[PDB]
Design an enzyme around this catalytic site. Structure first.
Site, PDB file in Angstrom:
ATOM      1  CB  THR A  41      35.857  -0.257 -57.043  1.00 15.88           C
ATOM      2  OG1 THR A  41      36.532  -1.450 -57.204  1.00 15.88           O
ATOM      3  CG2 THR A  41      35.928   0.407 -58.411  1.00 15.88           C
ATOM      4  CB  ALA A  96      36.372  -7.835 -61.737  1.00 16.31           C
TER       5      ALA A  96
END
EC number: 3.4.25.1
Lengths: 222, 233, 242, 212, 240, 62
Positions: D1, D49
């Site tokens: 990410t 997440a």
């Protein structure tokens, strides 16, 4: 020491078109190389043209559905029969999986339906909790086996127009309902050979504004 | 007899009749009229939707409880509410755990009991509201009356609230006709309209006020209004 | 006692009768619903010039698409307001869906439709009997603009126009026929001021009255004291011609 | 990410990828890592997440209640701290959050609070959280100034992701550009990183390590 | 009558215990707030007529809740001790969780919430104290004036008086102050508060206590000689 | 149309004089009405004036 969480194999597939959405799956139910059940459905109608399968550990999925059925009853009772939204269901489901976060549920869930706009729409849940709107998403251990086909037959990803050799990408083209059902059959037929999770039957519940159609095809048993 | 004995649920008069009980009944008389009846295959409730004034919308007093269940109130509004949500709860437990729809009779025994707990207790409210519950189980159509007492009674036809005299007579007469009539939703629903006209001082016959519910071996619990009740009105 | 364990000889409950008086003595509030927005007006009942009128408010934004004015007891009303805000916020978190006005009216009324200390298959958090009504106005997609009269007493009643408080008997009599569904949002504002003018002994100005609307477009929108003031000026003008 | 944020005079530029990997495979390239907590705040999904999503959906409620009660805009400080408290107390619940709460008030100016699953709350001018943070930092630091022009900051945000995206395995997707202005965040399109790579290649003569 | 119940809603719509609270506010000291453009002046009676009283350790009526939040009160001293403590804790709570310094307006509400709560919960009396909470909002330099009542609600006035002989003070506040314009200068503002208090104290240096609270945590209580100076100047005018 | 049974079930402890009060009242409504006929309905209402309560006391739900 008891097994904390089972697996019952299976592959499902939710595809968002622009006027229909299908939720497909095999009927083959397994533990190891034994077939537990040759025929046992997994796509379930939840009403108001929203279909649901919580694929993976079958027991966790039975629980999840079982509670959701009850919630559909109390959503309508308090809100004067407001049509249970697709998004509303989704937020609900997130909240069941986040319910035990410490020992998270082990289900990879897909709900498909129509959004309110009216396009086919698919929402997908990873077990960790998170959910997002998706275009095409297969679930399970053969999710990764099926997806490349769809990204080269409809999405036209990494396809370009013949003779440009890359200048001009080949633009999205909307497909009929039929065209998608064939595509779903072929993907699953190929996987019967290449994976032991998929077989017995391909039961597809298709959700439209026009109601619910049921489609069935046999797959081999070898 | 204000205060002293019979002033609280625990204290007995010498005879042992609570005066309060009769008052809870009076609440039903003050209540909205409703006529219930059945045949073997259908159970039909007709209730007049009361309103305050023209601009206030004609308010539903027939409440769908479940897909295959529903009730109507005559009497004290807060009490009906606490009870109705409970009806819903029990039906859900059985469907989940034990598979089955909650049978109508067996739900009533529980409802009785709940009313008696508040009569045992120091304080609390004996429920001061009477409920006509209709339902479709595997014993087919039923119609109960729930009393403020607690008692649940399987009756072919009964009416509670305001001027019950005209519709009760009417039911006695046409008793034999609607019980033979089966396999005809539409005719049961007619019988029931005709019945509520007798009770009323012709307050209204409007489509706008009468609301008719039906659950049976044929129709699920569906609420009918406007045009659908204009057929039979 | 004369609680709720005591059933009135009447067939009523004594507390329920006692609640009504508090609404009767309450502030005068008017709402008239159109299909172009609902307009609510109140008297802020200014009493001294050292009182800061602006600060005080009896029309309060409850939620994005809903506001409420209050009539009854000032004390009860705190608790009632906190309940309502919470009830809305829980559903938004839980399903992330805009709620109906209908759904909100019910939920507020959910705490209301029980009285006593005794509970038998439920929780208690109450310790009394509350006596405060609201005008609950809003917009939902399904049925458009709705106005409800939420009662601390029997089941909620939907209204197309309602006036409550101490100016109620006159205000409401005027409304039955003056109400119509063909009014514009501009026609409707002036009509609310008109009734207000009559039932308030002291003359109408923007320091003791405030107007607000819920139109989906501008949300719950509190009128500028300038915007209010001009329409009062407009009101006097048309009455001179008339 | 890879997710990054920088404050400057013009506000804040927030830029994120869209890739999310489950196991060694790309699960998705459409998970939008911008969570609109409300019109004033942007939160990022970086870190865990699900945890991030769930707890900022929560954070939406707390902001809303505040706004209702005091009838004025919530400080970035007040909202990030509220989050911080909740997450410390529950830690040891498989929480892994890492988020930058980005907001531009005049109460405080542009303000970024990095919140963490441990319960740490750290202020900074520049934060970069990710697996690919490390790549991003090289290009970001050297064009980072407070008095960097607004126009240059927009380019910078796209370039910073382009770089991370290229080297890191767990990053690709697409660029979402957002500017946190005074009045709130404004969306500045989606731009596919895949395509941007070629334009940039041609335009500067960069991407020469790369064959051809 | 209905003084024995709180739960019982009363068809009078008025629970007597609530009425009785008011009797209790009246009896207490007079406490007054009058605000400028840049200040709150709080003029209040503190009795000191008590023989053999060591004045040093006797608590001043004004109590610092926060660093810039102050409280004066009228009504029973014992009952008032509970509000001061809850309110102090909540002060520091605010900073601990929002970081933000005490919003005064939250605090006004928090306090009233307690007098409200206890009206609903049987077996808990409503307090017979009315207070003045005054302060200055985060990031702001406009004075903020609030009163709370034992009816469990709150309101803001441009200037307000509570306690014994408040009727007398209210006429003064109408004619010498205005909502429209507060006395722009701090100085003007202080001198009028001294004249108001004189109407009910009728001459006292330590019987009159003036605390001026300015923005940005500026708390200073006027010197006895300066207070004495306001009095003499005013007293010259009285015979003219 | 009079059902003696229905009236008698709702009444409890009305001696002979009390009872005649009920009877006269049902007929008094009918005198105003103009019909020589008394209806069963007139009577059920007519009990509640002889009661302490005034007849058909207003109630919030209905």
């Amino acid at each position: 020491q008891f097994n904390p969480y089972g697996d019952n194999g299976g592959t499902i597939l939710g595809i968002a078109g622009e006027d229909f959405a299908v939720l497909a799956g095999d009927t083959r139910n397994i533990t190891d190389y034994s077939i537990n059940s040759r025929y046992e459905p997994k796509v379930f109608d939840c009403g108001d043209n929203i279909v649901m399968s919580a694929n993976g550990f079958a027991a966790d999925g039975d629980a999840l559905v079982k509670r959701f059925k009850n919630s559909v009853k109390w959503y309508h009772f308090d809100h004067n029969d407001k049509k249970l939204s697709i998004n509303s269901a989704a937020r609900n489901i997130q909240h069941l999986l986040y319910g035990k976060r410490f020992f998270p549920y082990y289900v990879h869930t897909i709900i498909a339906g129509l959004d309110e706009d009216g396009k086919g729409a698919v929402y997908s849940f990873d077990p960790v909790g998170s959910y997002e709107r998706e275009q095409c998403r297969a679930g399970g251990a053969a999710a990764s086996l099926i997806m490349p086909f769809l990204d080269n037959q409809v999405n036209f990803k990494n396809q370009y127009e013949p003779g440009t050799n890359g200048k001009v990408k080949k633009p999205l083209k909307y497909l009929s309902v039929e065209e998608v059902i064939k595509l779903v059959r072929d993907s699953f037929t190929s996987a019967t050979e290449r994976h032991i999770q998929v077989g017995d039957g391909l039961e597809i519940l298709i959700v439209t504004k026009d109601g619910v159609r049921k489609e069935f095809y046999e797959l081999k048993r070898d | 007899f204000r205060n002293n004995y019979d002033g609280d649920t625990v204290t007995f008069s010498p005879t042992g009749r609570l005066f309060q009980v009769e008052y809870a009944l009076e609440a039903i008389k003050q209540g909205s009229v409703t006529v219930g009846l059945r045949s073997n295959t259908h159970a039909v409730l007709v209730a007049l939707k009361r309103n305050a004034d023209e601009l206030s919308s004609y308010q539903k007093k027939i409440i769908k409880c479940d897909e295959h269940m529903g009730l109507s109130l005559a009497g004290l509004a807060p009490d009906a509410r606490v009870l109705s949500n409970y009806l819903r709860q029990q039906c859900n437990y059985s469907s989940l755990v034990f598979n089955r729809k909650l049978a109508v009779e067996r739900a009533g025994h529980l409802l009785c009991d709940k009313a008696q707990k508040n009569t045992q207790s120091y304080g609390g409210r004996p429920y001061g509201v009477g409920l006509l519950i209709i339902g479709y189980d595997k014993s087919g159509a039923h119609l109960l009356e729930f009393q403020p007492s607690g008692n649940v009674t399987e009756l072919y036809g009964t009416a509670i609230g305001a001027r019950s005299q005209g519709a009760k007579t009417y039911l006695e007469r046409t008793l034999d006709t609607f019980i033979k009539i089966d396999g005809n939703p539409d005719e049961l629903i007619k019988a029931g309209v005709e019945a509520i006209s007798q009770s009323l001082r012709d307050e209204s016959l409007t489509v706008d006020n009468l609301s008719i519910a039906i659950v049976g071996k044929d129709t699920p619990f569906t609420i009918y209004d406007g045009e659908a009740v204009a057929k039979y009105i | 006692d004369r609680g709720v364990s005591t059933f009135s000889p009447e067939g009523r409950l004594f507390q329920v009768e006692y609640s009504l008086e508090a609404i009767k003595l309450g502030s005068t509030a008017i709402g008239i619903a159109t299909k172009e927005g609902v307009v609510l007006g109140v008297e802020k009942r200014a009493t001294s010039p050292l009182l800061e009128s602006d600060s005080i408010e009896k029309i309060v934004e409850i939620d994005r698409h809903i506001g409420c004015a209050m009539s009854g007891l000032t004390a009860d009303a705190r608790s009632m307001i906190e309940h309502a805000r919470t009830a809305a916020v829980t559903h938004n978190l839980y399903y992330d869906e805009d709620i109906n006005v209908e759904s909100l009216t019910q939920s507020v009324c959910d705490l209301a439709l029980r009285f006593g200390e005794g509970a038998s298959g439920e929780e208690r958090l109450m310790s009394r009997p509350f006596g405060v009504a609201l005008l609950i106005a809003g917009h939902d997609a399904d049925d458009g603009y709705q106005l409800f009269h939420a009662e601390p007493s029997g089941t909620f009643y939907r209204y197309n126009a309602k006036a409550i408080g101490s100016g109620s008997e006159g205000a409401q009599a005027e409304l039955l026929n003056e109400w119509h569904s063909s009014l514009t949002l501009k026609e409707a504002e002036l009509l609310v001021l008109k009734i207000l003018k009559q039932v308030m002994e002291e003359k109408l100005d923007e320091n003791n009255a405030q107007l607000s609307c819920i139109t989906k477009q501008d949300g719950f929108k509190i009128y500028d004291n300038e915007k209010t003031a001009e329409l009062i000026k407009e009101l006097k003008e048309k009455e001179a011609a008339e | 990410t890879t997710t990054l944020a920088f404050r400057f005079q013009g506000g804040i530029i927030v830029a994120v990828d869209s890739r999310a990997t489950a196991g060694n495979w790309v699960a998705s390239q459409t998970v939008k890592k911008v969570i609109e907590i409300n019109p004033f705040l942007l939160g990022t999904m970086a870190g865990g997440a699900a945890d991030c999503q769930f707890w900022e959906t929560w954070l939406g409620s707390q902001c809303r209640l505040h706004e209702l009660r005091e009838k004025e805009r919530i400080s970035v400080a007040a909202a990030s701290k509220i989050l911080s408290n909740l997450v410390y107390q529950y830690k040891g619940a498989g929480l892994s959050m890492g988020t930058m709460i980005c907001g531009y008030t005049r109460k405080e100016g542009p303000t970024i609070y990095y919140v963490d699953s441990d319960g740490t709350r750290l202020k900074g001018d520049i934060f970069c959280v990710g697996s690919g943070q490390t790549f991003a930092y090289g290009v970001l630091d050297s064009n980072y100034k407070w008095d960097l022009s607004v126009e240059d900051a927009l380019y910078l945000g796209k370039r910073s992701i382009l770089a991370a995206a290229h080297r890191d395995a767990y990053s690709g997707g697409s660029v979402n550009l957002y500017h946190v202005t005074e009045d709130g965040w404004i969306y500045h399109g989606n731009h596919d990183v895949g395509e941007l790579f070629w334009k940039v290649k041609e335009e500067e003569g960069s991407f020469n390590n790369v064959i051809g | 009558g209905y003084d024995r119940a709180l739960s019982i809603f009363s068809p009078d719509g008025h629970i007597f215990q609530v009425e009785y609270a008011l009797e209790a506010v009246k009896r207490g000291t007079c406490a007054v707030g009058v605000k400028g453009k840049n200040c709150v002046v709080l003029g209040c009676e503190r009795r000191s007529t008590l023989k053999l009283q060591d004045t040093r350790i006797t608590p001043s009526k004004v109590s610092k809740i926060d660093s810039h939040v102050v409280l004066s009160f009228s009504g029973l001293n014992a009952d008032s001790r509970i509000l001061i403590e809850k309110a102090r804790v909540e002060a520091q709570s605010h900073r601990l969780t929002l970081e933000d310094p005490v919003t005064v307006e939250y605090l006004t509400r928090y306090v009233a919430g307690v007098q409200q709560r206890y009206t609903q919960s049987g077996g808990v009396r409503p307090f017979g104290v009315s207070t003045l909470i005054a302060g200055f909002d985060p990031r702001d330099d406009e004075p903020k004036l609030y009163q709370t009542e034992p009816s469990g609600i709150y309101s803001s006035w441009s200037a307000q008086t509570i306690g014994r002989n408040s009727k007398t003070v209210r006429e003064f506040l109408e004619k010498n102050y205005d909502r429209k314009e507060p006395p722009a200068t701090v100085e003007e503002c202080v001198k009028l508060t001294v004249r108001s208090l004189l109407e009910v104290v009728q001459t006292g240096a330590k019987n009159i206590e003036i605390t001026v609270v300015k923005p940005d945590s500026d708390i200073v209580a006027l010197s006895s000689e300066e207070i004495n100076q306001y009095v003499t100047q005013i007293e010259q005018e009285k015979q003219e | 149309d009079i059902n003696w049974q229905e009236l008698a079930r709702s009444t409890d402890e009305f001696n002979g004089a009390q009872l005649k009060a009920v009877t006269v009242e049902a007929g008094m409504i009918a005198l105003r009405n103009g019909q020589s006929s008394v209806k069963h309905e007139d009577f059920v209402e007519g009990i509640s004036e002889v009661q302490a309560r005034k007849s058909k006391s207003v109630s919030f739900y209905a």
